[PDB]
Every structure is written in structure tokens, then in C-alpha cells.
Amino acid sequence: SHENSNSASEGSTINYTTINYYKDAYAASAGRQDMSQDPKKFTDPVMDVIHEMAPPLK
Amino acid sequence: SHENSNSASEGSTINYTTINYYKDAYAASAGRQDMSQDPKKFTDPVMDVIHEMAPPLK
Amino acid sequence: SDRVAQLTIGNSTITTQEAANIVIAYGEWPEYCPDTDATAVDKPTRPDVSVNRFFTLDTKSWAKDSKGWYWKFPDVLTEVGVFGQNAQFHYLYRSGFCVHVQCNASKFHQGALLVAVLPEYVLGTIAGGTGNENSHPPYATTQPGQVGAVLTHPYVLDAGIPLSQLTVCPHQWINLRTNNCATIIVPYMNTVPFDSALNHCNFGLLVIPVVPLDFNTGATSEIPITVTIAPMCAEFAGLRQAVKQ
Amino acid sequence: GIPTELKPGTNQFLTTDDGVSAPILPGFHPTPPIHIPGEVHNLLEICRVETILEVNNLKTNETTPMQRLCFPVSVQSKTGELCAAFRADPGRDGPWQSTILGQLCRYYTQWSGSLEVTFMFAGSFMATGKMLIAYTPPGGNVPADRITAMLGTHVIWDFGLQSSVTLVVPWISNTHYRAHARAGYFDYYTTGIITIWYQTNYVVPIGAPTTAYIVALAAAQDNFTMKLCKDTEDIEQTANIQ
Amino acid sequence: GIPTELKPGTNQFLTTDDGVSAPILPGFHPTPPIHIPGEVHNLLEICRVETILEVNNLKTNETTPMQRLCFPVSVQSKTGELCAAFRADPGRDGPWQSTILGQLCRYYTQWSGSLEVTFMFAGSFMATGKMLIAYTPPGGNVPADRITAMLGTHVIWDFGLQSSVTLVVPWISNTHYRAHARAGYFDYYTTGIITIWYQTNYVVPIGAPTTAYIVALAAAQDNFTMKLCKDTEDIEQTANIQ
Amino acid sequence: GIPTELKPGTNQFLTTDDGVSAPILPGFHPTPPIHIPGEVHNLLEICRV
Amino acid sequence: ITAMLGTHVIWDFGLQSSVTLVVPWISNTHYRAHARAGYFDYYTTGII
Amino acid sequence: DPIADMIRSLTALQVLPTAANTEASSHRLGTGVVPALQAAETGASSNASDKNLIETRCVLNHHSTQETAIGNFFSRAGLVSIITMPTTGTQNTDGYVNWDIDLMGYAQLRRKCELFTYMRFDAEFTFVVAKPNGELVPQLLQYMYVPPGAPKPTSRDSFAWQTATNPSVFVKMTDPPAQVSVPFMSPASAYQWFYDGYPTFGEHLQANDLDYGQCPNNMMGTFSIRTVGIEKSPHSITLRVYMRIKHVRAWIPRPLRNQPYLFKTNPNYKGNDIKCTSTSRDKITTL
Amino acid sequence: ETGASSNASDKNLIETRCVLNHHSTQETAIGNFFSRAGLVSIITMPTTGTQNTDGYVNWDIDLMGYAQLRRKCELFTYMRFDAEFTFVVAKPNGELVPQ
Amino acid sequence: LLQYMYVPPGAPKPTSRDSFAWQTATNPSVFVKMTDPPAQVSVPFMSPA
Ligand SMILES: CCCCCCCCCCCCC/C=C\[C@H](O)[C@H](N)CO
Ligand SMILES: CCCCCCCCCCCCC/C=C\[C@H](O)[C@H](N)CO
Ligand SMILES: [Cl-]
Ligand SMILES: [Cl-]
Ligand SMILES: [Cl-]
Ligand SMILES: [Cl-]
Ligand SMILES: [Cl-]
Ligand SMILES: [Cl-]
Ligand SMILES: [Cl-]
Ligand SMILES: [Cl-]
Ligand SMILES: [Cl-]
Ligand SMILES: [Cl-]
Ligand SMILES: [K+]
Ligand SMILES: [K+]
Ligand SMILES: [K+]
Ligand SMILES: [K+]
Ligand code: NA
């Protein structure tokens, strides 16, 4: 079955291997979750990137 | 399954992606609705077509 | 070469000889709203230099017993310069910010301020103490203006949440023995592309002394803290007459 | 038999479920369709059609409802006078309720798009005048005077052979969609205010009426869409239909 | 009809079952998404972020909680003094409960990985000193003296322009994963003990405070993972939420 | 819905039935296995001892 | 708070003993005659 | 041309199915390099790893990171509402109930959602109904969704139950629990658990300070229920509603609630009894 | 007077920005507006009274007895369609019995 | 109507028929009637060993 694209997660699908029998995508299961991560935006949101070698303040 | 063509909407099917398990087409689901429109017949049913540039009465 | 810095925007320039890098909130630079995300159809006004410049607000005094302060954005500037005027004359507003908090002491003082940005900083009340009273914060507390306000219970950020975890938000520390300022660049964050600069505060700036100020008597005791902020990529739409609230 | 397992939802009847049900008349064939003018496919086709706005919705009109279909203009004695005012909120109680647009969007929870109000002057041919029509986006209550209203989106209309003028109520919202506005928390979705002022004056020579009327027609523009189908408040089965 | 046969499980509602349910609004389309900074995809992204450890979790602090966010160091009169101690167990009641890491791993039954504690010195610039920070893996209670603690994994910290130092609590376990440790049979999963000693002394010249504080921040390293999602003990609906 | 018809055996629980049951922990991953001497696969391996 | 609205520099004391304030040429005329009280105050440059 | 003056994100996504490996390392003795020293003032977390502070062996780590994907953390049905229709008392001897949709009444789910500032998702709602003592009887019920602006039923037989446009579900207390999928319905791009603002313009006199924090973009309307019949039903009814988030995205993490919840609509806390996030002990030098 | 609606659009009356509108028009397709089950009749067979102590009822098919659905259909003059009829039955108090 | 819930080590154990723990927002729970067939689920290998 080829459906209406109305799932909440489609701009950059956090899922991608779902099951469904209805014409509306949001009825689909959650599917297998992907393992993407980008910790840097939270752990290193600094302008000059501080290395783990020299002292962070030179 | 290949059916009897007895749906109310077949002269110009307002649907087109239906599901069905019976020999009669009218038993089928509603399917995904198409997005055709022709507002002009209601908004501009005039003989000489009036442009949105010059004055509508010349 | 990471401790020295200069910020120049509009007709204003900031210098510092004891910085500790610069933070770009969630790794994103502010930017004008793109046509794919926009919804309002009127061509916006993007004043540029008259509003994307540094504004310095009233200074606070840090005492051995201070609890901490906070300011709301864009509330702080709704009545300052050309930025405020644009915020009043338009229904819609959107911008990012460069926040620069200043505080210098001497090599003999000590203490540490945590400078953080908390999106959608909703405040709560102590519920009449017992918790049976469903009280709410008054306008003056939710939108303190350019003077900012004081935290009554910093440990729970006057909102039932642990200060201990605030570092999960964009932040820097001003540790007197190390630096004398904090700089954070904040991009527009909201569930809508533009919004009212009067009814909705996008984020709050908190400055809390986690390690209390101390010094031997005889040393300068007036240790102020100054906040200088600059809107970035300020855009406005839905022009009409001026409204203050 | 094949191993199956019933899941939650089993036996429920969801009024909006689009499924398949057994046919009662096997081999039945409907009367063929024939061509009929006026087929519609999407409600939006109708929302683009101008219908009459009841700007003159006064309590004193209710018994002579026809008078609600148009409002007056007349020779002013003072300059800058306000002629009429009303909210642009289309799904709200008020003038818009008389339009097909208003009625239809009440069958949906949210809407988005630019609106359009066209004013037709029905005075005598000898009457002239200039009016200032303004749309004041959210924030400021009804503008106190013409000089304040003038700061918003507006059109300065001149009477002439072209009987009408079109005010555009451009979509200027914070959210991509607006739910129907009403007093309370939902006033957050208000669209704004439309005001009509005398730019100069209704002028007429000796021999022609000193008062005339204007009809206001409203409809949606091409970027208009609605979503979240719902029941309308505008109809009630107060009693049994016999 | 097709031969089927209901199997056990039929009609049950499993709260974690990932199935398909009928949609209530056919043809509905959500508001489009827009770009918003700060999207997260995996809790691990957060666990890598340092948050404040309440090492100074004294009963006498409870009424002045702010004092729990940092502990002191001051001019010693005797050498080799112990400055502070605490367990490394992150899911256990104690100092770690104040960290986002601790709170989040309480939503999982097991964890695995190396931890990291970074200490920031907040004394005056004129203050100097060397501390010995040690991690004592399972087996030995709190080391009695610095000379015993010194035998474990440790870092000797020197105060200077670099305000901070990082102690690594390397994953040293018998099992691949640890369940949350607590007194009893589950002490089998304890991670160990962290101790902070005076390597030399906090030294300061005339004119500067003789007591200063240290803030401890903790987080997970890249080999950290959690498993077996569960409910946290850290929140309770003591009474109805109105 | 699809025409079905329940057959005898419906609802029964046969202790030796080798079927599929819904998983309680979605996305869960077991501790990896490690090598351990002495694995057996068939009881006959023991009967020969 | 009022002065802050003009062209300015925020100076921080440190190893660099000095800072430079720029008084950019912001005039209506291409040239200014010497300003003094009276009609010639028209050519005043401004205030630091 | 005759006027010259009239003329991003440094971090992105990677797929990490497994925890990082540990590379073997040996002793490092030298000047200049000093990975153990950090500067937390910058706002960054420490970049030091095991191999920099100790001698490590090689470890091929296959631990999965999948169970901590926000989808697996949230897609677990949780209780969001308990609705009751008793036959005797001041409650609802009317045979019907209108419930304003607000899911912040139960802590377990609420604390999990409040870990983020904004969330966008679809949801699976399951309706578990029974008598108050857990017994089941052959009672026919009707659940109806009344979006903002739709007429709310005023009685067990109000015309509104004709449900010609609103979606309704008819199910027996004896059938399994009803279950449906709901799309993302805010007029905004995401639901927001925190809205530091007011819903409307005006002066915000202390009389209407209950407006603070109320975001209309999260107000989804009313959920109505009734026993299907013109005559009153003899049975008290208990309806528990569970929600399962699916197809989820989340933005801006925040500190987790550490004080008991008092009200559905705000973060007010009991000021006389401010709990410490961590348990206490006697000395900082003793366990 | 022509009978046509105004052809003016935003860009002609004001200065506009560019907006890439992705709002869907699907939910207003007549099919999604009508394909929602609505009540068209309530039939009763009581055991005592003047109603139908006969055990059977003959109902003339007329769906115009309930306003919600009727007003929606009357938006048009002519309609052609197929239909799904669902029959929900119970005792008058909502209870169910093996009948 | 019954409710079976799995409370992993460290999760709050219900202390009453209506303890908050039954909100089961994260723990897996099964709701079934004594009249439905027997509930059945799959459980993975959960030891930390
Ligand atoms: C026929 C079954 C109908 C079921 C309809 C349920 C619709 C519920 C939609 C979920 C909306 C998410 C919750 C949104 C906002 C929060 O409750 C806010 N805190 C309320 O102020
Ligand atoms: C075994 C189940 C049998 C169900 C048969 C139901 C047949 C009903 C067909 C629908 C016809 C559409 C309604 C037609 C006309 C309107 O009622 C008119 N206003 C009556 O004058
Ligand atoms: Cl998964
Ligand atoms: Cl569709
Ligand atoms: Cl406090
Ligand atoms: Cl078979
Ligand atoms: Cl409206
Ligand atoms: Cl069959
Ligand atoms: Cl632990
Ligand atoms: Cl079906
Ligand atoms: Cl009814
Ligand atoms: Cl319960
Ligand atoms: K069917
Ligand atoms: K289902
Ligand atoms: K099974
Ligand atoms: K790996
Ligand atoms: Na380093």
C-alpha cells in the first residue's frame, strides 16, 4: 500500500523501517530506531576548538 | 482479485488507490483522495476574461 | 590567542584580555528566517546596524551573599534604542543574540559565576510555602525588564529544577582566577519562525554565583557584574502602530 | 488454521476508519453517470468565492435582517471619521459568519492563508469619495484615529467607474496555522482588525442622496488551506426533526 | 473465510508493543516542521555532558543546599590529609544523583563504560597547590591514608592557569555491564571509591583567603552505554497533581 | 477486514507449541556472549560418556 | 545607558596597557570649519 | 554597484551503533602535552579519555547504543488520565463526561517529557475501561474527540454525539481495549512543555496571572465519553487512558524535575520543603 | 458586478517576501469531508407501551432526520456515492444481552 | 481485569493496589482479562553476565 505522507517524523525520519496497513503514515509503528548522534553540539559548543593535547587556555 | 466495475465513482474516479477483497468494486475503501481543483468555474465564470491588471470595465 | 578577543558589531566594539573562548549555543549561528520555514507573507524589515549592535544594561553588585540574577529575552531590550522601537511597532520579531557578561576582580579575590542560557525559562512560585496555594508569578517577575530580577531559591532555579544540571545548557563560567567574562552566541529557538517580542520570552540568561565571592578585608569590595548584549540578524514583520504590551 | 493474535482495537467501531465492508447486492450495476455542470472536488474551490459579509450586524437590525447586508457612508461634517470596524478573524462569531468561507472553515479546527475583502460602492454615479481601509495585525486594539490606523497594511480607495476595491488581509501570523480565535487563551490566534475611514469625504452635488451603501464581499486567496476536520457549532438539533 | 487460529497473547495490551493502530483523522496533514537548534537523538548525547556533582552532601547542608555544589580546601597544618571521599557508583544514592548522568541512568537497569570527573579549582589566582585524586577499584574500603590510596588509579593535580583537571574512572568490572549498586547482594556491582588527598598543601601568600572551593563536574566517556529501560525511583506522585 | 474463520485449537495453550510472542523490551540488546569451554549441543554428546 | 547607544569601545585592563577609540568622521558636510559657540556649533564633532 | 556596502553549524551527525573501542596505550612522559588539564570555564566538557590518563589494553566493544535512542525511551505506553463516571454521588450521575485534554497530571510520563523543551510526535492511545473494582460488564460506550471549537455534548443524548464529523469510537467494556493512532496536531511545529510567556496582549494584572505559561498551541480540545443509551446505566465506570509516543523528535534538553509536582499547568513547588537532589551523609570524608 | 470574485493577490497590494508554502489541500477534498460515519437513524423496539410490542419494525429509509449529516449534504444540490452502513445495537440503557 | 508488570532491579515496587508505580510509563506492563486466553510474551537474555 502507497500512502499519504503525514507522519510527524519525515523531515529527517528518526525511524525508517516501519509497518503499516492504512493510507495514513502516522498510523505506522515506531519501527527500528536509528543510531545517529552528534554529542559535540552539547559537549564542545566552542568557537576555537580546544584540543585534548595542549592546555585549553593559551 | 479482478472485479466487477460497479463503484459509484468510475466515470472520473475521485479516488484511485483503494483496497478490496470482494468481487464488487463498491465494497472497496474510500482510498486516498486526489487533489484536483478547478476554482475558475466558480470564481471567474465570465466570457471576456477580466485580467487583474487593467480595470475590469473598459 | 584564546584569552584575548574583540567583538565588533554595529557601531560598537568589546575587548577582553582574559577570555575563555566563546560558546556557540547548540553549535548554531543565528541566521535570518529562510523562505522554506517562513509563513508570514509580508516582506520583513531587517534594520541591520541600528539594531544588531551592543547594548549595555544596568550593572549589578556581587556580594559575599548574593543569590543570583536572571534576565529574559527579548524583554530586556523591548524599550531600548531602535531595537525596542521596532519590537513595539511590529507584531512579529525574530533574532539571535550575542551575550557578553563582564566581571573582573584581582588576583587576590576568588569566586565563580555560572553564566547560562535557558530556553523557555518558565518560573514557578513557592506555592504559599505549604504547597496548597496555586499562586503565580506577577508580570514584574516573569518579565523583569532591563534591570533583571533576583533568584530566591537558586538551588532549584525558582522552577523546581536542579541548578546542578544547568550546565546541560549553553554556558561558561567566570572563575575570577581564570577569566573576567563569558560570551555566548545564541540562535533563534522557538516552535514558530517569528513571534511576539512582548508576549513571549525565548530564553533567560542566568548568572549565579556557585562558588561565593570572597576576599580579605582591605581589598576592593565593590565587584560589579555587567551585562552587554547584541541582537543578531534581527528581523521584524506585521507593521502597525506601536504597542508596549 | 493460521496462527493469529488479536490486538487492541479489536471489535471497535471508529467512525473515520476507511475500511472494506461486504457488499449487499452482488453483481449490481449503478445507473450510469451523465454529465452535470458544476462539479466540485475540494471545499477550497468554494472558499475562493466571494460571499456577503454582515458588517452591519447590529442588535437593532435583527428584525430587518436585510439591512445587515450593507453598511452606509454619507456626507461627513468632520474629517477623518471612522466608518466601520470589525475583526478579520474568519472563524469567529461576527460578520464573517454570513460568508460561505466562514461557515465552511467552521467545519475545520485550523486554517492558514491570506484573506481578501472586496468592497462595492452602491451610491449614485454622481457621488465621489476616497476611503482609507486598514488591516491592523495583532497587538493593537481598534485604532483610535485614522492617523494611527494608517500605520498598518492599508488601501486608499477612490470611487469611480470601477465600483469596487480589494483589501488584502495578508497572512501575518507567528504560527503556520491558526485555530479559531475567541475570547480567552485562544485570542492568541486572532487575525486582527479591519477599519474603514474617510480619507476625504463622500461628496455629492445637488439632486443626489446624501447617504449611500457599500456591500462587502469576502473570500480566501490561493494560499488558503484548512485542517483537522471537525463538527460545526453553527447547527443544532434543538428539537426532533419530524 | 481464511482458516485462522487464535494463539496465547490474544487480546492482551502490552504497553511496549510496537504495533499499528487505525488513524482517527484520514487525510490529515501536520504543520510542517521548521528548523530548531538543539535536536537530540540519543540520551547518550546528554550523558556525555558534564553536570555538577554534590560531593558536599551533608545533613547540615540541606537547608542551605547551594553549599552542596562545591567542597573546600584550605591551608593544612598536617601533611597527607584526606580532603573528601565518595563512591564512583553513578546510579547509587549520593553525590551522583545531582548529575544529569546519574538521573538518566536511573531510567535504565544496567550500564557499562568509563566515567570522567573534572575538578575545577575556584580559589584565588595567588593560591597554589598539588592534590592526589584516586580511584580505588572494588575490594578495599576507603583507603586509610594517602600512601594506601596512592596504589590505585590516580592523578596528581597541580593548580595553575589551567583551572581544572580530569580524573578518569576507567571501566574496570568483571561483568560486561553493572546493574545499579546498593547495599546488599547488589554491592557486587559497586564501581569503587574516589578519594582526594593533599599531595603538598594549599599555599597562599599574605592577603588571600585561606579557604577556597572546588567544583566537581561528572559525565560519561565514549564507551558508555545503558540497557534495559526501566522506571526511575527518583520521582513520585506523593499526592494528586491538580 | 479480511475474511477469516476461527478453527478448532483457537485460544488453546499447548506447552510445546513453537510460536512467536510479542517482545517486552523493544530495542534491547543482550550482554555479548564470550567464549566458554564445554558447550554441549545434543544430549547424545553426554550419553557417550 | 544613554551613552552606550553611540559609537563606543569597552576597554579591558591587561598586558596591553592601551586601547584606541575611533572618532569616525560622521558629518553632513564634506569638511568642517572650526566649531565654537554660535552659528559655528553647526560644525561640532560631538562628545566623548 | 555604486554602493559597495550592499554586497551555519560547525558540527554534524554520525552513526554510532556501538560504544567506542579502547585502543591500547603505553606510557607517555614529556613536556608540552597535557591532556589531563582542562578549563571548564570554556563551557566544554572534558576531552580526556582513558588512554590519556592510564595504560590501556585494546577492547573491541560491541555494546549497543540502540536502547537509548529517544524513540525507545519514549515509545512505551504510560498513564495520562483516569476518568470516572459513577452512578451515585456528586461526581457524574449524568452518564457522560467531558475531559479537557491535559496530559501533565501524572508524574512518570511528565518528568520524561520535561527532559526536553520541544517535542514533535504522533501517538497511539489505548483505552482501558472497567468497573471501579476491576470487573467487566456488557456495557456499550462511546468515546468522542471534540476539537477546539466543536460543540461539547451537554448530556448523555446531546445532538453532538451524532458525531457526523468528529471522530468517535464505539466499543464494549468487554471487548479488548480500544486503540487508535493520532497525528501531530499543534498549529505550531512542535508541542512545547515550557512557554515563558503570555497567550495574549494586554496588562498582566495579578487577576490574570494564571495566563502565564499557557500555550494555546498545546490545547487540543476535549475528550468526551458516555454510556450509549437514552436511559441511565447502572454501572460505575473507570476509564484509564494510556499514551504511546511514536515517530518522535526532541529539542533542547533541560534539568530534570527534582521537586514533586503540584499542578498540571506550572512548575510550582513546595517552598517549605525543598528536597535536595542527593541523599545526605554526616561527613564529606566518610561513606 | 461582473459576477467574478477578485483576482487581486497579496503581491499586488503589498510588498511580499518569498514563501515556499507546503500546506496540504488534501483534507478539504470532498471525500475526506464526507467519509466519516454519522448518525442517520435511531430505531426502537420496546417491550411495553404503544410503540412496538410486536417484536419488529419497518422503517422508511429517509436520512434527513439528523441535522449534522443533513447540513453537510445540503451544501450540494446533487451527490452520487456508495455507502458503508454500520448498525450499533444495545438495550436502551446501553447494556448488551444475547439477543 | 488484571495488570501484570515487570519491575527491574532498582525500579520502585508498587506498595498498594493503586501505587503510582502502576502508571507503568517505562516498565513493561500487560493488561489482560481472566476471560481472555492466557497472556504470552517474549523475554530477551537479561543478565549483565
Ligand atoms: C477517539 C479518540 C480521541 C483521542 C484524542 C486524543 C488527542 C490528544 C493529543 C495529544 C496532545 C499532546 C498533549 C499536549 C499538550 C499538553 O497536554 C499541555 N501541557 C496542556 O497545556
Ligand atoms: C441489510 C442492510 C440494508 C441497508 C440498506 C440501506 C439503503 C440506504 C441507501 C441510501 C440512500 C440515500 C438516501 C436517499 C434519499 C434521502 O433519504 C431523501 N431525502 C428521502 O426523501
Ligand atoms: Cl528499535
Ligand atoms: Cl485521503
Ligand atoms: Cl537556594
Ligand atoms: Cl486449518
Ligand atoms: Cl478565526
Ligand atoms: Cl469467506
Ligand atoms: Cl551504580
Ligand atoms: Cl477493513
Ligand atoms: Cl445518540
Ligand atoms: Cl492506575
Ligand atoms: K467491515
Ligand atoms: K492496534
Ligand atoms: K503468542
Ligand atoms: K565499537
Ligand atoms: Na587538555
Residue numbers in the entry:
A (entry chain D), B (entry chain D): 12 to 69
C (entry chain B): 10 to 254
D (entry chain C), E (entry chain C): 1 to 242
F (entry chain C): 1 to 49
G (entry chain C): 147 to 194
H (entry chain A): 2 to 8, 18 to 297
I (entry chain A): 51 to 149
J (entry chain A): 150 to 198
Q: What did the publication describing this PDB structure actually write?
A:
Enterovirus 71 (EV71) and coxsackievirus A16 (CVA16) are subgroup A human enteroviruses (HEVA), small, nonenveloped single-stranded RNA (ssRNA) viruses whose protective capsid mediates cell entry and humoral immune responses. The external portion of the icosahedral capsid comprises 60 copies of viral proteins VP1, -2, and -3 arranged with pseudo T=3 symmetry, while their N-terminal extensions and 60 copies of VP4 line the interior, surrounding the RNA genome. There is a “canyon” (a depression encircling the 5-fold axes) on the surface of enteroviruses that often harbors the receptor binding site, and there is a fatty acid binding site below the canyon base, within the hydrophobic β-barrel core of VP1. Here, we remedy this with high resolution X-ray structures of both mature and natural empty CVA16 particles and also of empty recombinant viruslike particles of CVA16 produced in insect cells, a potential vaccine antigen.
CVA16 (strain Ningbo.CHN/028-2/2009) was grown in Vero cells and formaldehyde inactivated prior to purification. The sedimentation coefficients and λ260/λ280 absorbance ratios were ∼160S and 1.67 for the mature virus, and ∼80S and 0.64 for the empty particle, indicating that the latter does not contain RNA, and SDS-PAGE showed that VP0 is not cleaved into VP4 and VP2 in the empty particle. The crystals of both mature and empty particles belong to the same space group, P41212, with similar unit cell dimensions of a = b = 491 Å and c = 709 Å. The mature CVA16 virus particle contains VP1 to -4 and is well ordered apart from residues 1 and 9 to 17 of VP1, 1 to 9 of VP2, and 1 to 11 of VP4. Given ∼80% identity (with no insertions or deletions) in the capsid protein sequences of CVA16 and EV71, it is unsurprising that their overall structures are very similar; 823 Cα out of 832 match with a root mean square deviation (RMSD) of 0.5 Å. The most significant differences are on the outer surface, including the BC loop and C-terminal residues 280 to 297 of VP1 and, in VP3, residues 58 to 66 leading to the B strand and the C-terminal residues 233 to 239. Thus, residues 59 to 62 and 65 to 69 of VP3 form 2 short helices linked by a tight turn in CVA16, compared to a loop and a longer helix (62 to 69) in EV71. The inner surface of the CVA16 particle is similar to that of EV71 and distinct from those of other known enteroviruses: VP1 starts adjacent to the icosahedral 2-fold axis underneath the αA helix of VP2 and folds across the protomer, while residues 12 to 31 of VP4 form a loose spiral beneath VP1. VP1 contains a bound pocket factor, modeled as sphingosine (similar to EV71).
